[PDB]
Amino acid sequence: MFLRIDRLQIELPMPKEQDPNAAAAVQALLGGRFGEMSTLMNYMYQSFNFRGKKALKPYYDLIANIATEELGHIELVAATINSLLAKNPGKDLEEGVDPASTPLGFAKDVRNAAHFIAGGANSLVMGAMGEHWNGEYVFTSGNLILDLLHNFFLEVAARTHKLRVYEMTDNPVAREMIGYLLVRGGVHAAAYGKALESLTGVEMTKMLPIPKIDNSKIPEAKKYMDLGFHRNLYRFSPEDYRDLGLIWKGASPEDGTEVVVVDGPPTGGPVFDAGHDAAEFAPEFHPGELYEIAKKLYE
Amino acid sequence: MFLRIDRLQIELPMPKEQDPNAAAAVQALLGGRFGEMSTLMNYMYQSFNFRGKKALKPYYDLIANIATEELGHIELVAATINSLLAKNPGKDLEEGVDPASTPLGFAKDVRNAAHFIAGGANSLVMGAMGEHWNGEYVFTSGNLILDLLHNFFLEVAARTHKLRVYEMTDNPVAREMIGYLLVRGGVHAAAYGKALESLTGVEMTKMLPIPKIDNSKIPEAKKYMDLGFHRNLYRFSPEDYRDLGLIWKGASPEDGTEVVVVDGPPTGGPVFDAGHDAAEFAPEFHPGELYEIAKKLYEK
Amino acid sequence: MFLRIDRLQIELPMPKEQDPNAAAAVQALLGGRFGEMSTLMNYMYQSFNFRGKKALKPYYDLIANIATEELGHIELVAATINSLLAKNPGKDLEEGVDPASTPLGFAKDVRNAAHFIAGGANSLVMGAMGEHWNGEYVFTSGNLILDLLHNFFLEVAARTHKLRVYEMTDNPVAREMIGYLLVRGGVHAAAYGKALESLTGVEMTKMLPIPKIDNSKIPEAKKYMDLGFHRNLYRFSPEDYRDLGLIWKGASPEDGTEVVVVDGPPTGGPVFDAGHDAAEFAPEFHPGELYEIAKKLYEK
Amino acid sequence: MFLRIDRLQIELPMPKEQDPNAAAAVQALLGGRFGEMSTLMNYMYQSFNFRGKKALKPYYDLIANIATEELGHIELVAATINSLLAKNPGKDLEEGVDPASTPLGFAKDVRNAAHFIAGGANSLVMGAMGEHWNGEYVFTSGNLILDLLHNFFLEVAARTHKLRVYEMTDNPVAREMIGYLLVRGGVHAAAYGKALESLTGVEMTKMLPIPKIDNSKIPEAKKYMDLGFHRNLYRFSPEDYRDLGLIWKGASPEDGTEVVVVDGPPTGGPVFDAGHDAAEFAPEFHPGELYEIAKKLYE
Amino acid sequence: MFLRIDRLQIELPMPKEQDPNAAAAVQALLGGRFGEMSTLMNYMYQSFNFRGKKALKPYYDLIANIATEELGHIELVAATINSLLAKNPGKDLEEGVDPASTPLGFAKDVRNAAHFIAGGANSLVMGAMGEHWNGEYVFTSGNLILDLLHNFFLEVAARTHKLRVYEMTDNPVAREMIGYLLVRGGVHAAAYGKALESLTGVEMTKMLPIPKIDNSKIPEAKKYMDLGFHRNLYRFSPEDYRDLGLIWKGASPEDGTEVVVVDGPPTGGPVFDAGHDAAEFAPEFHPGELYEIAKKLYE
Amino acid sequence: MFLRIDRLQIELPMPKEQDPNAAAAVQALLGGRFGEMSTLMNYMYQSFNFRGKKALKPYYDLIANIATEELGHIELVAATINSLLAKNPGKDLEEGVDPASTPLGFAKDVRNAAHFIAGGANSLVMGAMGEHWNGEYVFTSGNLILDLLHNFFLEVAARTHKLRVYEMTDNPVAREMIGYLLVRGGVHAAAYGKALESLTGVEMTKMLPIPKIDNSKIPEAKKYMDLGFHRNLYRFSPEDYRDLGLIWKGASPEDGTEVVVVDGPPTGGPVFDAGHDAAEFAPEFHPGELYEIAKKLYEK
Ligand SMILES: [Mn+3]
Ligand SMILES: [Mn+3]
Ligand SMILES: [Mn+3]
Ligand SMILES: [Mn+3]
Ligand SMILES: [Mn+3]
Ligand SMILES: [Mn+3]
Ligand SMILES: [Mn+3]
Ligand SMILES: [Mn+3]
Ligand SMILES: [Mn+3]
Ligand SMILES: [Mn+3]
Ligand SMILES: [Mn+3]
Ligand SMILES: [Mn+3]
Ligand SMILES: [O]
Ligand SMILES: [O]
Ligand SMILES: [O]
Ligand SMILES: [O]
Ligand SMILES: [O]
Ligand SMILES: [O]
Ligand SMILES: [O]
Ligand SMILES: [O]
Ligand SMILES: [O]
Ligand SMILES: [O]
Ligand SMILES: [O]
Ligand SMILES: [O]
Ligand SMILES: [O]
Ligand SMILES: [O]
Ligand SMILES: [O]
Ligand SMILES: [O]
Ligand SMILES: [O]
Ligand SMILES: [O]
């Protein structure tokens, strides 16, 4: 079972302007083959399907816990996309939009028209080409070593996509999110590498980083490393998955320092609200009446 | 952000027999168009994409919270499929399996060969025809009324699929899960109906049940209604989403009794472990050495 | 614009037995790559997209008219599938079905479980592997000769699929439909062949039949040829598409006799009603109340 | 069975210039999830699969007849797309196009290159992202109330897509078509709402409009309402489906006026011919010889 | 079984500048429905599945040999796409690229972002809309006449796509490749047409060309015709498939001259190397160390 | 550019019986996610897309050469499927088949009806659920280390699928092919492991075998190891890719013996011909006339 906390894993800066094509590129990190939907659903199904949950408990705890962190990653990437598509962030009411004045004319010429037609200028479950995420992006073989090898590859392939998207947009909301997730992805790759070392004797973490560029060369990632976040494996559970530290110990591949298990989630930051976009009819064309109904429910 | 508890939402009975084609039908309720992956991902993305999170807070809390419940529903359906596919449930070691003796011969003739080739006799992210779940099963329009109307429909279409699968298998593990999820789906359809009533004045809950058969006629659902679970909207959050009761109030469509918000999750039941299946190499062909490595991690 | 007549293009025999796997194979002829949805949608979009509607009028009339015939072919194939899936054909009410008695147990083991879970034991828009029909099965290049060459191929590939399905089931409902559509497909292949002959001088009709087996060797097709239906290109329009006979003239490839344009549709046969299937909740679990509401609409 | 009339459901204005990206957006209303292919094929298959065709005849007549109207809607949307892609509308012959002069250079940079490579600058069976229409967009459950609830939702979701596309293009051919189909979609949603009211007692039409913007605020839709088209359910059959008026009666949700069944189709307008586009080889590179062959067939 | 020669079927000119949208269009000729993956895989599977390999040997030889030529065609189209995407062709090392300077900013706005995110600015197995090539583009019925009729259609449909893409780009690398493949596709269509003539008596080659524009009107194709390449069916095998000349004989549909079987492959041209693209991390962010490792392997 | 030799990479045994559901499972090894189409197309496109073809020549030669071997692997798997589907292997003519006698009746109930409807009882480009192979199964990142890590994983995942299919069928044609390809896949995984060792210093070959079962425990694989085929990396090129031995050197992970580069392809075995199947119209309903036309081409 799961619980939800109404906070993003980090504070994101507010967007300054809409950037549809940047949002279309960041979609690769949500619903593309190596996006956060893929890391999430791989680890989630592997955790359900895991055989030997007590006999191999440290490895089960690792996969089950990292799966839970990835729920917050899809949330963070979606918030970033929604920030890049928000017309009036934090504003509950915009008046005077006339459909006959062609208020979505700009959207005719952007890469991803579905953001504006199918979504209400919001994230969709797709990648950078409009390809919808699909369940064949999940690998759940039941064999522990094979699944772990897959997962090590998955995290470094996902890092490669993150780096390429970082190089396509200078938007600060996108770059803050990518910088943070580069650091978290390094933790995941190191954790799966340490798991493989323990089972096979092969020094998988010595292969990192892939590609051969250090996270410290990305300014936003370096800030999170200076805060220690490459050391931290957070235990996203009230009482379970306590044997993480049997695998998550020893040196960080980033800088040789000792890694730690943090009990509990980070404090994080506020959730994002894109505000009213009348031309998208979101949350309504004119939501004044709905706001009144909601206020009356409290009375 | 999210937290995880290592418990299923209910206790499942232990499986007595492998039933591959029952597992292949139950996959409709996991990764088909109207399966639990669809209810989960619809409400999850709607909750991310929600505009007016404070100004429309009771409606946001509702969607965000039900999305969280659906995480435990994909977990429960996956455990059920895994139970139907398990050869040696709860047994850590089986010895003497020889690949050349054709130990997976039976799987040549079952509907879903992917369960045995791509999976290790385990759940996959697909429906009853092998079709993989896909993101176009999600509807996230940004318009509150339209999304809620979609969600009311989605829950009753999902109920229709659950009832049809229930009629295809008499396996007690599958029927226990379906009975419980019929009750929970009734709660969700009623909640979205009540939300629509509040916003539009249209008495959507008077349309229930769809199809026109009461949950009380399904014995495994009636068992859970007798314990009161059709009245409960659990708040799956330590501190957030506290305004659920502004919508989840009044009469249950099942029996006219007053519905309630429960703080926190249900007690639940234990997670399921399908045990060793050597022919699937799961968790390994012979996992003895891996078990020894894991034990040494504790000693160190 | 289009009009509808509440009749099938032929009378079908009444089904005597449910045959799920026969229905799953006949789906190839509805929603597979070379099924009737493909012939329909190819000619429909080609007719929309046609350039030179007046200057090339005889060719436009041909494509626009055959597209209209294909609407009745998807209808006929769907009726055949529904006949193979019907539990109580023509019976409005079945009583005493209890979901807990596993009334759909047989469907756990059939090839196509979607017919029973997603459909109400009814046709779906898919082929014989459960693959859903898709728009990339349409070819609409805008080039007349290339489109006609495609269409000639499409009809003979579709014929090949029909013959193979015919060889898989001896069900009389399926074989009657296939026999009739073999004759109609021969007309369409001959028509597109004659069109290509007129434009290129290449004697495309001399390539027929493909495969090299005559329709007269299939008893149900021979029945319809004995009534003359291989000679007839029906004009499915009140007043339009009158220049068909500029292409549809001369000898039939079947038997050398002169072909004819018939104004208007054939007489046809009655539409099919699969009746009540309570386990599928179709049209309702117990439709008595709905039948009463419908009767009261007339009294009012 | 079906019959065909060589007329569009309305007269469309002639296009002034090619607008490829507008055509790419309007494709959402043809082959996207909530396009006219979806309303068509949903009602068509529901009508085939309907159980109790005599016992529930008024409801069968409604679905079977609306399915037939939707055939004219795919035709109208295709004509609109073809108008937006037509280089020389109504011109049978253009001479002097040289392939080596790069006459399709502009198409390199448009959103939908398939319109120009796979089609001959013509409509395709796809949506606004190039996604091909697929049969899983059809819902045919066999349960009357569930199918009708789906269909009510389908029409208001489709209306939402129509409105968003309307806001992306000011092209008069697109706006005339959308204005007309907004009115027809309102009729369909009202008809399915009235059907649900009769079966369940739930006042579904009181939920309209969705989104909460009136069709009268869209100028092209208002013109068709002033002509009475929101009142009309046309019976698209010579002799069948005569019990429509048992459901299609009473007040229109738009303005409270009494609705009517019209016997027979509207008069409509002429079909569209995009003319010769030599660079697309459509209907041929130089069609002069083909035109001569066609003329000789008449002799 | 197969053997490989490290040469392209023709020499391609070097690219002058990156042209992403031209590459995105040329993808139609690689992984679209009528691209070279389709001609390749159709003939390959037909050759595997062929019944009567000795009794119908001339027809088997034809299909099996043309399948082998198509392997070189996917190679040539991929090289063309890679040329259009290459930043520093023939340069093994570029230094001084900083990810934080947004070196892939231009890629945010191009049609195909996957070329830069999923690929390392390289070809992918997809068409002009980002649609991935799929196995349902193969037709392998087992019936010889039906498969040959399909294949004749396939080659002329593919020619139509080649011509339309030619008209979208004036890039010399693309036009050289298309000009050559127009000539080779004419050979294939003529060969399948001659095969059908021999089996059915229907004069299929009299239908060529489709569309009705001669290859001689395309300057790059005319050059290859002046070199005689429309006459040549190359036998791509050391010792097998020697009965080609029983079908590939008689007159060319292009100019009436006698066609010939050439024993063995053409000499061709060098393979293409796009060089280092640091922002794509291809072959590495900084490959100096990898180059040193490779040099030491020789010692 | 490429050349073709009309030989399979090994001699296959002749089939004794049609086994449709075995063929449907073996399809996983052809057109599924981890089938031979995926190993082929991954290495083929990586070889096209390779940057630093001279500066990193040994690694280019490796990928370009293994891609060429994989062409013969799709050929071998297709021949195996065709063997399992062949009615009259090696027989050019069968007479007396009447379509109206339902000669494909058995195919109504098998898993993969497409083999008989869309194919002429022949291989298709799909996996074990009927899913068609697709281009997103290819990974071509341009980064050498990342691509090699992918390829090492791909070979061991493919091995896992081969072992599971081996356990589903005892058919000798399928098991001979699988035994040989287990040995060849071990060579490929070892080669990519050695390449990764050279570039990173990580001892990837020490992870093998995955799963933890040795090829020598599969009798048909052991047969080929006894002949030395696990030591051989064949150079499938007349004159190119000569620097393979800079990586393919040192110990075999199977048995510690020294591995070798062999110039040129193996001798191989004959290609397979499924013969005439009249009910599939393959190569024709009655191919006598076609055989006569072919013979006359030689006389002329
Ligand atoms: Mn992550
Ligand atoms: Mn991660
Ligand atoms: Mn649920
Ligand atoms: Mn629910
Ligand atoms: Mn037809
Ligand atoms: Mn036809
Ligand atoms: Mn409509
Ligand atoms: Mn409508
Ligand atoms: Mn080619
Ligand atoms: Mn070719
Ligand atoms: Mn292989
Ligand atoms: Mn391999
Ligand atoms: O991740
Ligand atoms: O991540
Ligand atoms: O991550
Ligand atoms: O759900
Ligand atoms: O559920
Ligand atoms: O649910
Ligand atoms: O057809
Ligand atoms: O047909
Ligand atoms: O047909
Ligand atoms: O519609
Ligand atoms: O519409
Ligand atoms: O509509
Ligand atoms: O080709
Ligand atoms: O080609
Ligand atoms: O070609
Ligand atoms: O492989
Ligand atoms: O392999
Ligand atoms: O392999």
Tab-separated table of N, CA and C in Angstrom, chain D residues 166-213:
chain	number	residue	atom	x	y	z
D	166	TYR	N	-10.707	25.212	-32.928
D	166	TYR	CA	-11.271	26.496	-33.383
D	166	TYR	C	-10.398	27.668	-32.932
D	167	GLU	N	-9.873	27.601	-31.711
D	167	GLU	CA	-9.067	28.667	-31.146
D	167	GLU	C	-7.654	28.717	-31.708
D	168	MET	N	-7.246	27.740	-32.518
D	168	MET	CA	-5.911	27.675	-33.094
D	168	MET	C	-5.851	28.199	-34.521
D	169	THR	N	-6.968	28.241	-35.232
D	169	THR	CA	-6.947	28.672	-36.615
D	169	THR	C	-8.088	29.641	-36.867
D	170	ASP	N	-7.805	30.700	-37.615
D	170	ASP	CA	-8.867	31.593	-38.073
D	170	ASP	C	-9.253	31.354	-39.516
D	171	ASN	N	-8.845	30.256	-40.084
D	171	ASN	CA	-9.190	29.979	-41.463
D	171	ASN	C	-10.706	29.813	-41.622
D	172	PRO	N	-11.336	30.499	-42.580
D	172	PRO	CA	-12.801	30.446	-42.660
D	172	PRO	C	-13.342	29.096	-43.039
D	173	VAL	N	-12.589	28.278	-43.768
D	173	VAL	CA	-13.130	26.973	-44.122
D	173	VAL	C	-13.184	26.082	-42.885
D	174	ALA	N	-12.119	26.128	-42.079
D	174	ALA	CA	-12.095	25.398	-40.819
D	174	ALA	C	-13.153	25.898	-39.858
D	175	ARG	N	-13.305	27.218	-39.731
D	175	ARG	CA	-14.268	27.748	-38.763
D	175	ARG	C	-15.721	27.503	-39.168
D	176	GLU	N	-16.034	27.478	-40.466
D	176	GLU	CA	-17.386	27.158	-40.888
D	176	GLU	C	-17.709	25.721	-40.533
D	177	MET	N	-16.770	24.808	-40.817
D	177	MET	CA	-16.987	23.402	-40.513
D	177	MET	C	-17.132	23.185	-39.013
D	178	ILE	N	-16.267	23.812	-38.215
D	178	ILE	CA	-16.326	23.604	-36.772
D	178	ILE	C	-17.600	24.188	-36.203
D	179	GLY	N	-17.994	25.377	-36.664
D	179	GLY	CA	-19.232	25.967	-36.182
D	179	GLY	C	-20.435	25.070	-36.424
D	180	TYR	N	-20.511	24.481	-37.613
D	180	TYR	CA	-21.605	23.562	-37.916
D	180	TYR	C	-21.559	22.325	-37.034
D	181	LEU	N	-20.383	21.729	-36.897
D	181	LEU	CA	-20.283	20.499	-36.120
D	181	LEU	C	-20.435	20.743	-34.626
D	182	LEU	N	-20.112	21.933	-34.112
D	182	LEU	CA	-20.468	22.228	-32.724
D	182	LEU	C	-21.968	22.117	-32.513
D	183	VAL	N	-22.750	22.646	-33.452
D	183	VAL	CA	-24.208	22.574	-33.342
D	183	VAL	C	-24.691	21.132	-33.456
D	184	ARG	N	-24.165	20.377	-34.425
D	184	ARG	CA	-24.578	18.981	-34.563
D	184	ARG	C	-24.157	18.156	-33.365
D	185	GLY	N	-22.978	18.440	-32.795
D	185	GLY	CA	-22.545	17.698	-31.622
D	185	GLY	C	-23.402	18.010	-30.422
D	186	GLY	N	-23.920	19.237	-30.347
D	186	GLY	CA	-24.834	19.569	-29.273
D	186	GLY	C	-26.113	18.772	-29.383
D	187	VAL	N	-26.593	18.580	-30.611
D	187	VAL	CA	-27.768	17.744	-30.839
D	187	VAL	C	-27.503	16.323	-30.390
D	188	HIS	N	-26.342	15.775	-30.756
D	188	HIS	CA	-26.039	14.403	-30.369
D	188	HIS	C	-25.936	14.250	-28.862
D	189	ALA	N	-25.245	15.165	-28.203
D	189	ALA	CA	-25.135	15.077	-26.757
D	189	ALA	C	-26.502	15.203	-26.102
D	190	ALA	N	-27.336	16.118	-26.599
D	190	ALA	CA	-28.684	16.242	-26.063
D	190	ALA	C	-29.501	14.981	-26.301
D	191	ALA	N	-29.338	14.345	-27.456
D	191	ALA	CA	-30.117	13.158	-27.760
D	191	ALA	C	-29.725	12.000	-26.859
D	192	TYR	N	-28.431	11.800	-26.662
D	192	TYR	CA	-28.004	10.754	-25.749
D	192	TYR	C	-28.368	11.093	-24.320
D	193	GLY	N	-28.339	12.377	-23.964
D	193	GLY	CA	-28.800	12.794	-22.645
D	193	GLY	C	-30.276	12.518	-22.423
D	194	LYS	N	-31.113	12.835	-23.408
D	194	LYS	CA	-32.543	12.511	-23.322
D	194	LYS	C	-32.768	11.009	-23.240
D	195	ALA	N	-31.998	10.221	-23.988
D	195	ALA	CA	-32.130	8.776	-23.886
D	195	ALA	C	-31.817	8.302	-22.466
D	196	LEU	N	-30.740	8.820	-21.868
D	196	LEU	CA	-30.391	8.436	-20.507
D	196	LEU	C	-31.440	8.896	-19.515
D	197	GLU	N	-32.018	10.089	-19.718
D	197	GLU	CA	-33.102	10.544	-18.830
D	197	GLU	C	-34.261	9.562	-18.857
D	198	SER	N	-34.614	9.086	-20.037
D	198	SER	CA	-35.775	8.204	-20.149
D	198	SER	C	-35.548	6.869	-19.461
D	199	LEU	N	-34.316	6.397	-19.426
D	199	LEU	CA	-33.988	5.094	-18.868
D	199	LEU	C	-33.668	5.129	-17.391
D	200	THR	N	-33.155	6.240	-16.880
D	200	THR	CA	-32.603	6.281	-15.524
D	200	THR	C	-33.258	7.327	-14.621
D	201	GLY	N	-33.980	8.302	-15.172
D	201	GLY	CA	-34.523	9.413	-14.406
D	201	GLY	C	-33.520	10.474	-14.012
D	202	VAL	N	-32.272	10.342	-14.425
D	202	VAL	CA	-31.226	11.310	-14.101
D	202	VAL	C	-31.206	12.364	-15.195
D	203	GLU	N	-31.241	13.647	-14.805
D	203	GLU	CA	-31.453	14.758	-15.758
D	203	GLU	C	-30.134	15.165	-16.419
D	204	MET	N	-29.626	14.254	-17.254
D	204	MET	CA	-28.306	14.440	-17.853
D	204	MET	C	-28.192	15.727	-18.653
D	205	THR	N	-29.250	16.158	-19.346
D	205	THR	CA	-29.122	17.362	-20.178
D	205	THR	C	-28.907	18.617	-19.357
D	206	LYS	N	-29.180	18.571	-18.059
D	206	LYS	CA	-28.961	19.726	-17.208
D	206	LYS	C	-27.472	19.976	-16.985
D	207	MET	N	-26.624	19.018	-17.344
D	207	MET	CA	-25.191	19.178	-17.216
D	207	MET	C	-24.614	19.974	-18.373
D	208	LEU	N	-25.356	20.098	-19.476
D	208	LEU	CA	-24.857	20.794	-20.648
D	208	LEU	C	-24.965	22.305	-20.446
D	209	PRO	N	-24.064	23.095	-21.053
D	209	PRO	CA	-22.955	22.678	-21.924
D	209	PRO	C	-21.718	22.294	-21.139
D	210	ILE	N	-20.925	21.433	-21.764
D	210	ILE	CA	-19.584	21.070	-21.290
D	210	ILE	C	-18.643	21.296	-22.463
D	211	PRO	N	-17.539	22.040	-22.307
D	211	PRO	CA	-17.252	22.952	-21.208
D	211	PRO	C	-18.323	24.033	-21.098
D	212	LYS	N	-18.251	24.841	-20.044
D	212	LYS	CA	-19.313	25.804	-19.713
D	212	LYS	C	-19.108	27.087	-20.517
D	213	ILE	N	-19.335	26.946	-21.818
D	213	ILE	CA	-19.350	28.040	-22.777
D	213	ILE	C	-20.441	27.678	-23.770
